[PDB]
RNA sequence: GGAAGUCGGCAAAAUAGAUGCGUAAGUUCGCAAGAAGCAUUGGCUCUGAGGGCAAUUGCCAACUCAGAACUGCUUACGGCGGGGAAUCCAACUGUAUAAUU
RNA sequence: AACCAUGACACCCAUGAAUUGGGGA
RNA sequence: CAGAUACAGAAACACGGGAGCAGUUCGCAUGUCAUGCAUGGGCGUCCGUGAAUUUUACUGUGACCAAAAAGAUGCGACCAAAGCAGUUUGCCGACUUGAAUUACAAAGCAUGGGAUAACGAAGCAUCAGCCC
RNA sequence: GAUCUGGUUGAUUCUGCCAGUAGUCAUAUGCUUGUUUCAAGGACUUAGCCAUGCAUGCCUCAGAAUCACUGCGCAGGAAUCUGCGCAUGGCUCAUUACAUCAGACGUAAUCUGCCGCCAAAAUUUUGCGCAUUACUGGAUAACUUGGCGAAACGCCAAGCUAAUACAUGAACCAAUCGGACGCUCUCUUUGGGACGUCCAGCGAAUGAAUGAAACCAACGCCUCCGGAGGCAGUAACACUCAGACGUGUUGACUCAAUUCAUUCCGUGCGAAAGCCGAGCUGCUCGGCGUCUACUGACGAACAACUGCCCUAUCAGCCAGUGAUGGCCGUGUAGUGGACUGCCAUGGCGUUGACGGGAGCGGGGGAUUAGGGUUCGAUUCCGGAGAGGGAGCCUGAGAAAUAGCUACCACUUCUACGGAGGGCAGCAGGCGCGCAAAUUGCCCAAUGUCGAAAAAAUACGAUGAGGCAGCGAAAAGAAAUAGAGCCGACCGUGUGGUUGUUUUCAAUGGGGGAUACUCAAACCCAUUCAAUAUCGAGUAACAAUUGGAGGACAAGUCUGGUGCCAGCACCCGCGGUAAUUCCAGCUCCAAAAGCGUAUAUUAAUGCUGUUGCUGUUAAAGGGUUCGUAG
């Protein structure tokens, strides 16, 4: 029943200065968790500098200019998370919320056709009154009649402008995933195997594109496609490939030197 | 008020718990119901998270099921006959879960004659029903321990609800070794 | 896991857990222990001195919080 | 009102049965101890525990203890310790001037 | 000043004359 | 070649609600009152059932970990204590950054088996070929 | 930086403690202080007592306006009703050791407004009198008419009128599916079909079923009117639909979900019987608002594996009246000895229970060869409280203090009948003490609440929050002068130097804007012409605080006192020549700073795990046996 959020207690990925104000906007309940999201006021005022103060974001959001799932949103503290399309029809730009190679939020400009597509991760499958199989999704959507082959770990390709399911991508070794939590967030790799551990957390072993190996809990992977090429959505710049820290420092140093 | 916390009990070592903080509302209790037998009266209790419970005071009749025949029927409660917590609960004519009561059994005599054609309005019957009874009669049998009870018009049953919680008195007839348990017990 | 210590109750036993605690300053260990009471169904039959595996439950009493599986 | 009476609380008043709890200094470790002190107690209608003999059933005997609901008091035969803190003497039970010790 | 003012168990450690008890030549 | 000796998480027996059309390796015909517009020699999968069926501490590498503070990677805020920002010999813009760490003990996947400690035994308390 | 020095003897080598020494966002007091940047600030003692003022409310195009309200029917709308919030924030640390808290985990034992996806086929109603089909009812505020009462967040009666307050109630035209009957009709030999009647929506309670996967007699089919095969094929179901589920989920379910039987009466269910834009009584399109059912998120409560100072001049603790477990029960949202009845005799402890002392936990600070010692009221997270202590209403959520009720201690007004008060919120006062700031400005930023974007014929609140005043707690930069000239020189062998005259530039303390900042003011940062703008020379724009026997840098200087006065942290000095007192002159340290007091860290191998000592300096038990370890 808390209603505030102190600055120091806010997530670090919002990158709010500790010398500017004492409070942060608390995200209202909704599609995504408080820790794993960033609000609409943050995006409008901090990522793209459309608005300077927080009163100006109201002058944009209360008019319904900004849309987040094909429906305009007027609440600044709306929680927006992974794989979400943000479009401002007046300005004509559309972004998709993804994780960059360092586990931070990334907004990548998408095409017109892409902006109508969204990927969802199944989390639960149950039966309604009567016999209605409905599957819950990582962003909270409920799908009324999915493919009878859908299960917990798979993913769904969803059309947002008109509500129907495009295709279902199951789980298996061949597919390519993206890690969505655990300090390996933002890496793309293939499924080498998955370990069971009944009653506890499954461990999925993955192989990077550059031949590296990494592991994480099976509840942190979001299967994108059956191959790197066959990705329904766009990808960030690095394509989720992490390289050595000393090499990063050296490349940055020489690049600054050639630049000037 | 009444409290359900553990701050007043003794530790397993026998030590005495020192209490800081005052009493809280989340662990409150409430006084019981002591549901009697008679004309129906209930009171509404406002529970946690909206909602209401039916504090049953002097319920009269309820729905009693017949497991072997997969049937149920509405019947009246005559008197409480047995309790396991205490004898004092029987004397006060209180109703709680798992009491052993007595019921009229007149409705159940109606159902059996209608379903099977055996009476312990039968001659008036269509030929389709007059042929269906023999079908059921061939593959179904009944026990003397319950045939005698229906003849006497008094059936033993047991409560299967929480009258101080849901405000009803439902139950089921006693069949088999369980019935023979209480027959010897009385 | 633990060692069955006492079986004087009814459908209930006491198990002992022995472990070692490391003090940083002296770079050495020391024996400790903890006692835990659990519920034991009549399928099993443990004697004092055996080893048992116990899994968590919902509060079944003032102290009982574990249930016995696979006496050995 | 409460020992102001009187040499002196003399005489009177006062405590009181039973049950549950609780009980100090001192000590020769046995006691002191019923220390001190607190609570309950009627009537009526019920419930439980405590046994014997014949073939699980039947029949039969003794009043004791514990518990509950309702109901009532004008505190209501007889019989039945007042208590505590100290000083002097004699260790103690006992005997002993029938007729003033 | 119950004192060797010298806790108990185990290992290594240079020489020469004596002494108490058992054993071998 | 097989089998036979050792070893084995593993071995035998089954599941078509089991491997997005029952994995991998040596278009006539059925149906047509049809949207029937449909179907056209071993390994390794999966799930159950019986033989079998060792555990801990220590060490390597991963998993899992609010910020502020602390170490630090980059940038003359005139320096510094700071703060994450800022730089173009100019326009209706460009490059963008904000790295990466740690953690009393306990906890969790998997590697070795040297030093360790927890069980068992007290040996006549034991006797048990295999195949056809 | 892995450091040491003075005091036991006539001298020496030791043990050992006293004293010295460096820090401390560590407190206080003394002396002294030009500029600027960043900053803690009534915890310590008395969770002591408090005058006065303010701190939580909200209106859009979109619940409800006949203000005897205002502006030229239209607008703005005072006031009240209705909806949401006020359980957040802020302050303090009194209580507190199987408690709280930290790391790891759970709820298959539960509740959950606002928020996100999303669902809805039950209901015989209204007008006309049998044809039609959502223009439904009553009351109550605000107001005015009398008023009562010394007050007082005091209160009475009468007369009006609204709803997104309250209360009724919708056949229409709306599918699919299944049970029970009739002694109603038809056919052939439950047979089957039909016709009629009753029940069949979401949610709840009770009971039954599913919740899988390890040779004949009846029915189907074929072959050759009726009258005879004998098994090729063949998911099933007597037509209206020849596949309209033979397949939920979990690591695991008495869970999800389906069919059947008997039942819900207020303690549940709408198409708000509604609010704005348009477009064309009479229709179409678009923004809104609200009941009920379901599962995600923000949460709430509960269980808890491991860990956390000193004390044995604290050794046993727990059971009438719950202590440890069992059985049906009751209460709760839910499990539970949380609680009633009955039953058993258990549970904890030298691996320190029980009792006592200090104390809010943690993230972290100080000191740092390494190991450690110590502090943590305080800004982030968690818990708890609102003078003392208990109960409870309304809420989804409170056992709430700017909610109510009572008692206990202090306390205010009064007409003596009565009525009130709660600063450990903001600023301020008394007292207490060694000890701690203005009765300021603002919603510009950061956020919360809301019926709200901003703009107008039309400005939401907010001592949360921010800004400035006081402020050597502490921390970062940094002025108090730079070059030469001419004599007088000083030492050394001609090259720095020490005063005496005297120019010659430079710059800020100081003061002023074309002005910047600012929510408005202030401080920084710019600048003394851009035609066009003030200023050191005994630089009176003047640096202090401690010392000069040793430890320990610095006088065998000059006066005064005479074991007095005094210094001296320790050793010591002072009895007429004081290297130590009181002074003058020089000098030393560090400097806008520097002394003193108390506590604490390093010095300390003087607490020793790394790493001490025990013949004689303090210290081996009188000797054996012996259990836990
Ligand atoms: K006495
Ligand atoms: K000898
Ligand atoms: K309160
Ligand atoms: K104050
Ligand atoms: K000066
Ligand atoms: K002097
Ligand atoms: K020493
Ligand atoms: Mg009943
Ligand atoms: Mg007299
Ligand atoms: Mg007398
Ligand atoms: Mg005594
Ligand atoms: Mg007595
Ligand atoms: Mg005598
Ligand atoms: Mg005599
Ligand atoms: Mg930092
Ligand atoms: Mg000496
Ligand atoms: Mg105080
Ligand atoms: Mg919303
Ligand atoms: Mg309807
Ligand atoms: Mg209807
Ligand atoms: Mg305290
Ligand atoms: Mg304090
Ligand atoms: Mg706090
Ligand atoms: Mg107050
Ligand atoms: Mg001060
Ligand atoms: Mg000193
Ligand atoms: Mg001298
Ligand atoms: Mg020290
Ligand atoms: Mg000795
Ligand atoms: Mg001795
Ligand atoms: Na005697
Ligand atoms: Na001696
Ligand atoms: Na000695
Ligand atoms: Na640089
Ligand atoms: Na600077
Ligand atoms: Na820095
Ligand atoms: Na308006
Ligand atoms: Na209106
Ligand atoms: Na304070
Ligand atoms: Na409180
Ligand atoms: Na006070
Ligand atoms: Na009060
Ligand atoms: Na504001
Ligand atoms: Na501030
Ligand atoms: Na040292
Ligand atoms: Na000695």
Tab-separated table of N, CA and C (backbone and C1' of nucleotides) in Angstrom, chain A residues 1-4 6 22-26 29-30 45 54-55 62-63 71 73 77 124-131 140-142 144 152 199 217, chain G residues 85-86 88 90 105 115-117 119 245 247 249-251 256-258 294-300 380 445-449 452-453 465-466:
chain	number	residue	atom	x	y	z
A	1	UNK	N	0.823	-1.205	0.000
A	1	UNK	CA	0.000	0.000	0.000
A	1	UNK	C	0.859	1.258	0.000
A	2	UNK	N	2.108	1.118	-0.432
A	2	UNK	CA	2.978	2.264	-0.616
A	2	UNK	C	2.572	3.031	-1.864
A	3	UNK	N	2.882	4.321	-1.866
A	3	UNK	CA	2.525	5.175	-2.982
A	3	UNK	C	3.678	6.024	-3.486
A	4	UNK	N	4.851	5.934	-2.882
A	4	UNK	CA	6.008	6.699	-3.314
A	4	UNK	C	7.080	5.759	-3.848
A	6	UNK	N	11.369	6.393	-3.464
A	6	UNK	CA	12.524	7.251	-3.268
A	6	UNK	C	13.507	7.063	-4.414
A	22	UNK	N	14.196	14.171	-4.882
A	22	UNK	CA	14.217	13.124	-3.875
A	22	UNK	C	13.362	11.924	-4.264
A	23	UNK	N	12.408	12.083	-5.177
A	23	UNK	CA	11.438	11.043	-5.482
A	23	UNK	C	11.483	10.683	-6.961
A	24	UNK	N	10.861	9.556	-7.277
A	24	UNK	CA	10.708	9.015	-8.617
A	24	UNK	C	9.264	8.582	-8.816
A	25	UNK	N	8.792	8.512	-10.061
A	25	UNK	CA	7.390	8.139	-10.294
A	25	UNK	C	7.179	6.646	-10.091
A	26	UNK	N	6.296	6.302	-9.176
A	26	UNK	CA	6.018	4.901	-8.910
A	26	UNK	C	5.152	4.325	-10.022
A	29	UNK	N	0.324	-0.561	-11.101
A	29	UNK	CA	0.211	-1.963	-11.469
A	29	UNK	C	-0.271	-2.106	-12.911
A	30	UNK	N	0.068	-3.234	-13.528
A	30	UNK	CA	-0.315	-3.466	-14.898
A	30	UNK	C	0.426	-4.598	-15.577
A	45	UNK	N	10.544	11.952	-21.068
A	45	UNK	CA	11.345	13.033	-20.516
A	45	UNK	C	12.833	12.726	-20.457
A	54	UNK	N	8.312	17.603	-15.804
A	54	UNK	CA	7.287	16.576	-15.707
A	54	UNK	C	5.885	17.110	-15.953
A	55	UNK	N	5.690	18.429	-15.958
A	55	UNK	CA	4.384	18.957	-16.332
A	55	UNK	C	4.163	18.861	-17.832
A	62	UNK	N	-1.779	13.342	-21.593
A	62	UNK	CA	-3.206	13.520	-21.349
A	62	UNK	C	-4.001	13.738	-22.626
A	63	UNK	N	-3.339	14.040	-23.742
A	63	UNK	CA	-4.018	14.168	-25.024
A	63	UNK	C	-4.102	12.856	-25.789
A	71	UNK	N	-3.229	1.236	-28.510
A	71	UNK	CA	-4.220	2.028	-27.796
A	71	UNK	C	-3.512	3.169	-27.082
A	73	UNK	N	-2.333	5.851	-24.403
A	73	UNK	CA	-2.291	5.809	-22.949
A	73	UNK	C	-2.095	7.214	-22.401
A	77	UNK	N	2.610	7.079	-15.340
A	77	UNK	CA	3.216	5.991	-14.592
A	77	UNK	C	2.810	4.622	-15.122
A	124	UNK	N	1.412	-19.766	-18.257
A	124	UNK	CA	0.436	-20.624	-17.607
A	124	UNK	C	-0.673	-20.938	-18.597
A	125	UNK	N	-1.156	-22.175	-18.549
A	125	UNK	CA	-2.237	-22.644	-19.407
A	125	UNK	C	-3.262	-23.340	-18.525
A	126	UNK	N	-4.519	-22.902	-18.604
A	126	UNK	CA	-5.581	-23.444	-17.769
A	126	UNK	C	-6.888	-23.460	-18.551
A	127	UNK	N	-7.956	-23.875	-17.876
A	127	UNK	CA	-9.271	-24.044	-18.479
A	127	UNK	C	-10.259	-23.101	-17.810
A	128	UNK	N	-11.122	-22.475	-18.611
A	128	UNK	CA	-12.169	-21.624	-18.089
A	128	UNK	C	-13.466	-22.378	-17.861
A	129	UNK	N	-14.476	-21.640	-17.407
A	129	UNK	CA	-15.793	-22.230	-17.207
A	129	UNK	C	-16.389	-22.621	-18.551
A	130	UNK	N	-16.922	-23.835	-18.624
A	130	UNK	CA	-17.081	-24.499	-19.900
A	130	UNK	C	-15.816	-25.294	-20.144
A	131	UNK	N	-15.345	-25.371	-21.381
A	131	UNK	CA	-14.006	-25.896	-21.654
A	131	UNK	C	-13.317	-24.883	-22.554
A	140	UNK	N	0.818	-10.181	-19.390
A	140	UNK	CA	-0.491	-10.212	-18.779
A	140	UNK	C	-1.654	-10.441	-19.718
A	141	UNK	N	-1.423	-10.500	-21.022
A	141	UNK	CA	-2.513	-10.760	-21.947
A	141	UNK	C	-3.019	-12.187	-21.784
A	142	UNK	N	-4.304	-12.381	-22.063
A	142	UNK	CA	-4.921	-13.701	-22.040
A	142	UNK	C	-5.460	-14.020	-23.427
A	144	UNK	N	-7.620	-16.566	-25.862
A	144	UNK	CA	-8.798	-17.374	-25.576
A	144	UNK	C	-8.759	-18.771	-26.177
A	152	UNK	N	4.124	-24.229	-21.619
A	152	UNK	CA	4.597	-23.176	-20.726
A	152	UNK	C	5.724	-22.362	-21.350
A	199	UNK	N	11.369	-29.916	-9.043
A	199	UNK	CA	11.128	-29.223	-7.798
A	199	UNK	C	11.951	-27.978	-7.597
A	217	UNK	N	19.315	-19.589	-15.599
A	217	UNK	CA	18.098	-20.281	-15.207
A	217	UNK	C	17.103	-20.301	-16.357
G	85	G	P	-10.634	5.184	-2.123
G	85	G	O5'	-9.687	6.402	-1.724
G	85	G	C5'	-8.373	6.496	-2.249
G	85	G	C4'	-7.678	7.761	-1.815
G	85	G	C3'	-7.334	7.879	-0.341
G	85	G	O3'	-6.161	7.166	0.016
G	85	G	C1'	-8.310	9.891	-1.087
G	86	C	P	-6.051	6.440	1.445
G	86	C	O5'	-5.920	7.646	2.476
G	86	C	C5'	-4.748	8.440	2.526
G	86	C	C4'	-4.976	9.720	3.288
G	86	C	C3'	-5.213	9.592	4.783
G	86	C	O3'	-4.009	9.451	5.519
G	86	C	C1'	-6.812	11.063	3.848
G	88	U	P	0.726	4.450	6.245
G	88	U	O5'	0.900	5.235	4.871
G	88	U	C5'	1.214	4.554	3.666
G	88	U	C4'	1.587	5.521	2.571
G	88	U	C3'	2.780	6.416	2.848
G	88	U	O3'	4.025	5.764	2.657
G	88	U	C1'	1.022	7.716	1.967
G	90	G	P	9.342	10.407	4.227
G	90	G	O5'	9.008	11.504	5.326
G	90	G	C5'	9.506	12.824	5.207
G	90	G	C4'	9.001	13.703	6.320
G	90	G	C3'	9.597	13.455	7.693
G	90	G	O3'	10.853	14.083	7.865
G	90	G	C1'	7.253	13.602	7.874
G	105	C	P	17.514	-18.752	-3.434
G	105	C	O5'	16.040	-19.346	-3.369
G	105	C	C5'	15.062	-18.761	-2.526
G	105	C	C4'	14.550	-19.746	-1.509
G	105	C	C3'	13.082	-20.115	-1.628
G	105	C	O3'	12.853	-21.124	-2.596
G	105	C	C1'	13.584	-19.585	0.618
G	115	C	P	-8.860	1.809	-12.440
G	115	C	O5'	-7.407	1.215	-12.695
G	115	C	C5'	-6.275	2.064	-12.799
G	115	C	C4'	-5.041	1.288	-13.177
G	115	C	C3'	-5.216	0.289	-14.306
G	115	C	O3'	-5.178	0.903	-15.583
G	115	C	C1'	-4.006	-0.712	-12.535
G	116	G	P	-5.957	0.253	-16.828
G	116	G	O5'	-5.117	-1.053	-17.166
G	116	G	C5'	-3.811	-0.972	-17.720
G	116	G	C4'	-3.335	-2.334	-18.141
G	116	G	C3'	-4.317	-3.123	-18.989
G	116	G	O3'	-4.251	-2.767	-20.356
G	116	G	C1'	-3.457	-4.500	-17.263
G	117	C	P	-5.339	-3.329	-21.387
G	117	C	O5'	-4.781	-4.763	-21.778
G	117	C	C5'	-5.378	-5.503	-22.824
G	117	C	C4'	-5.310	-6.980	-22.552
G	117	C	C3'	-6.609	-7.737	-22.743
G	117	C	O3'	-6.895	-8.026	-24.097
G	117	C	C1'	-5.638	-8.368	-20.697
G	119	A	P	-13.569	-10.531	-24.575
G	119	A	O5'	-14.719	-11.300	-23.794
G	119	A	C5'	-14.708	-12.716	-23.710
G	119	A	C4'	-15.436	-13.199	-22.484
G	119	A	C3'	-16.918	-12.871	-22.433
G	119	A	O3'	-17.690	-13.840	-23.117
G	119	A	C1'	-15.893	-12.330	-20.362
G	245	C	P	-17.309	-32.343	-29.924
G	245	C	O5'	-15.829	-31.948	-29.504
G	245	C	C5'	-14.743	-32.148	-30.399
G	245	C	C4'	-13.643	-32.955	-29.763
G	245	C	C3'	-14.094	-33.934	-28.680
G	245	C	O3'	-13.316	-35.122	-28.759
G	245	C	C1'	-12.508	-32.427	-27.785
G	247	U	P	-11.218	-35.956	-24.847
G	247	U	O5'	-9.701	-36.149	-24.412
G	247	U	C5'	-9.329	-36.205	-23.039
G	247	U	C4'	-7.873	-35.856	-22.840
G	247	U	C3'	-7.495	-34.414	-23.163
G	247	U	O3'	-6.417	-34.007	-22.324
G	247	U	C1'	-6.323	-35.878	-24.602
G	249	U	P	-2.132	-29.537	-20.628
G	249	U	O5'	-1.782	-29.022	-19.165
G	249	U	C5'	-1.630	-27.639	-18.893
G	249	U	C4'	-1.383	-27.397	-17.427
G	249	U	C3'	-0.192	-28.120	-16.830
G	249	U	O3'	1.043	-27.497	-17.115
G	249	U	C1'	-2.040	-28.415	-15.423
G	250	U	P	2.380	-28.377	-17.189
G	250	U	O5'	2.775	-28.586	-15.663
G	250	U	C5'	2.992	-27.471	-14.814
G	250	U	C4'	2.967	-27.871	-13.365
G	250	U	C3'	3.976	-28.926	-12.953
G	250	U	O3'	5.265	-28.385	-12.718
G	250	U	C1'	1.850	-29.470	-12.072
G	251	G	P	6.529	-28.868	-13.587
G	251	G	O5'	7.326	-29.832	-12.608
G	251	G	C5'	7.768	-31.106	-13.046
G	251	G	C4'	7.855	-32.074	-11.896
G	251	G	C3'	6.529	-32.463	-11.265
G	251	G	O3'	5.935	-33.552	-11.947
G	251	G	C1'	8.104	-31.886	-9.582
G	256	A	P	-11.002	-26.185	-8.022
G	256	A	O5'	-10.382	-25.987	-9.474
G	256	A	C5'	-9.705	-24.789	-9.817
G	256	A	C4'	-9.287	-24.780	-11.266
G	256	A	C3'	-10.397	-24.942	-12.287
G	256	A	O3'	-11.107	-23.739	-12.518
G	256	A	C1'	-8.586	-26.332	-12.865
G	257	A	P	-12.708	-23.705	-12.404
G	257	A	O5'	-13.192	-24.740	-13.507
G	257	A	C5'	-13.012	-24.473	-14.887
G	257	A	C4'	-13.136	-25.731	-15.704
G	257	A	C3'	-14.474	-26.442	-15.648
G	257	A	O3'	-15.464	-25.847	-16.464
G	257	A	C1'	-12.738	-28.014	-15.420
G	258	U	P	-17.014	-26.062	-16.115
G	258	U	O5'	-17.335	-27.525	-16.642
G	258	U	C5'	-17.554	-27.776	-18.019
G	258	U	C4'	-17.785	-29.243	-18.269
G	258	U	C3'	-19.086	-29.811	-17.729
G	258	U	O3'	-20.193	-29.564	-18.579
G	258	U	C1'	-17.300	-31.236	-17.137
G	294	C	P	-14.957	-15.696	-9.391
G	294	C	O5'	-13.864	-15.822	-10.537
G	294	C	C5'	-13.880	-16.901	-11.460
G	294	C	C4'	-12.942	-16.635	-12.609
G	294	C	C3'	-11.490	-16.383	-12.235
G	294	C	O3'	-10.766	-17.585	-12.045
G	294	C	C1'	-12.213	-14.761	-13.803
G	295	U	P	-9.466	-17.612	-11.109
G	295	U	O5'	-8.358	-16.844	-11.955
G	295	U	C5'	-7.818	-17.423	-13.136
G	295	U	C4'	-6.731	-16.569	-13.744
G	295	U	C3'	-5.466	-16.380	-12.900
G	295	U	O3'	-4.327	-16.408	-13.763
G	295	U	C1'	-6.345	-14.281	-13.493
G	296	G	P	-2.829	-16.485	-13.179
G	296	G	O5'	-2.166	-15.129	-13.692
G	296	G	C5'	-1.167	-14.448	-12.950
G	296	G	C4'	-0.776	-13.166	-13.639
G	296	G	C3'	-0.022	-12.144	-12.804
G	296	G	O3'	1.369	-12.405	-12.756
G	296	G	C1'	-1.773	-11.078	-13.987
G	297	A	P	2.236	-12.014	-11.464
G	297	A	O5'	2.130	-10.428	-11.372
G	297	A	C5'	3.020	-9.588	-12.088
G	297	A	C4'	2.591	-8.146	-12.023
G	297	A	C3'	2.761	-7.455	-10.679
G	297	A	O3'	4.073	-6.968	-10.473
G	297	A	C1'	0.596	-7.034	-11.505
G	298	C	P	4.710	-6.963	-9.002
G	298	C	O5'	4.002	-5.744	-8.269
G	298	C	C5'	4.113	-4.423	-8.765
G	298	C	C4'	3.289	-3.457	-7.950
G	298	C	C3'	3.436	-3.542	-6.445
G	298	C	O3'	4.639	-2.983	-5.956
G	298	C	C1'	1.161	-3.302	-6.990
G	299	G	P	5.279	-3.582	-4.615
G	299	G	O5'	4.086	-4.431	-3.994
G	299	G	C5'	4.023	-4.713	-2.608
G	299	G	C4'	2.680	-4.342	-2.030
G	299	G	C3'	2.339	-4.970	-0.693
G	299	G	O3'	2.956	-4.329	0.407
G	299	G	C1'	0.517	-5.234	-2.134
G	300	A	P	3.522	-5.213	1.622
G	300	A	O5'	2.211	-5.769	2.326
G	300	A	C5'	1.216	-4.891	2.830
G	300	A	C4'	0.067	-5.681	3.378
G	300	A	C3'	0.447	-6.666	4.464
G	300	A	O3'	0.505	-6.046	5.733
G	300	A	C1'	-0.909	-7.740	2.847
G	380	C	P	15.960	8.530	3.198
G	380	C	O5'	16.731	7.302	2.554
G	380	C	C5'	16.650	7.027	1.168
G	380	C	C4'	17.022	5.598	0.894
G	380	C	C3'	16.147	4.563	1.570
G	380	C	O3'	14.951	4.303	0.861
G	380	C	C1'	18.411	4.032	1.947
G	445	A	P	7.752	23.112	-12.400
G	445	A	O5'	9.115	22.491	-11.864
G	445	A	C5'	10.231	22.313	-12.725
G	445	A	C4'	11.358	21.616	-12.012
G	445	A	C3'	11.074	20.191	-11.578
G	445	A	O3'	11.313	19.257	-12.613
G	445	A	C1'	11.979	21.400	-9.765
G	446	U	P	10.412	17.936	-12.746
G	446	U	O5'	10.658	17.153	-11.385
G	446	U	C5'	11.889	16.496	-11.143
G	446	U	C4'	11.912	15.841	-9.791
G	446	U	C3'	10.817	14.833	-9.524
G	446	U	O3'	11.092	13.573	-10.104
G	446	U	C1'	11.052	16.258	-7.657
G	447	G	P	9.931	12.731	-10.821
G	447	G	O5'	9.143	12.047	-9.621
G	447	G	C5'	7.727	12.111	-9.540
G	447	G	C4'	7.260	12.024	-8.109
G	447	G	C3'	5.788	11.733	-7.882
G	447	G	O3'	5.485	10.358	-8.035
G	447	G	C1'	6.514	13.438	-6.410
G	448	U	P	4.016	9.866	-8.457
G	448	U	O5'	3.114	10.192	-7.191
G	448	U	C5'	3.271	9.466	-5.984
G	448	U	C4'	2.311	9.925	-4.914
G	448	U	C3'	0.847	10.031	-5.307
G	448	U	O3'	0.196	8.776	-5.299
G	448	U	C1'	1.484	11.918	-4.028
G	449	C	P	-1.093	8.517	-6.215
G	449	C	O5'	-2.207	9.478	-5.606
G	449	C	C5'	-2.830	9.200	-4.359
G	449	C	C4'	-3.760	10.316	-3.947
G	449	C	C3'	-4.843	10.685	-4.947
G	449	C	O3'	-5.966	9.828	-4.851
G	449	C	C1'	-3.804	12.651	-4.128
G	452	A	P	-11.188	13.822	-14.351
G	452	A	O5'	-10.054	14.926	-14.524
G	452	A	C5'	-10.388	16.267	-14.838
G	452	A	C4'	-9.433	17.240	-14.200
G	452	A	C3'	-8.182	17.584	-14.988
G	452	A	O3'	-8.386	18.483	-16.061
G	452	A	C1'	-7.560	17.101	-12.795
G	453	A	P	-7.672	18.210	-17.478
G	453	A	O5'	-6.191	18.762	-17.290
G	453	A	C5'	-5.155	17.941	-16.770
G	453	A	C4'	-3.827	18.270	-17.401
G	453	A	C3'	-3.615	19.735	-17.752
G	453	A	O3'	-3.123	20.475	-16.649
G	453	A	C1'	-3.002	18.357	-19.588
G	465	G	P	10.865	16.645	3.449
G	465	G	O5'	10.732	17.188	1.960
G	465	G	C5'	11.253	16.458	0.858
G	465	G	C4'	11.060	17.210	-0.432
G	465	G	C3'	11.865	18.490	-0.580
G	465	G	O3'	13.195	18.258	-1.008
G	465	G	C1'	9.624	18.920	-1.148
G	466	G	P	14.432	18.879	-0.199
G	466	G	O5'	14.815	20.192	-1.012
G	466	G	C5'	14.929	20.169	-2.426
G	466	G	C4'	14.452	21.461	-3.039
G	466	G	C3'	15.160	22.724	-2.576
G	466	G	O3'	16.371	22.943	-3.272
G	466	G	C1'	12.816	23.064	-2.572
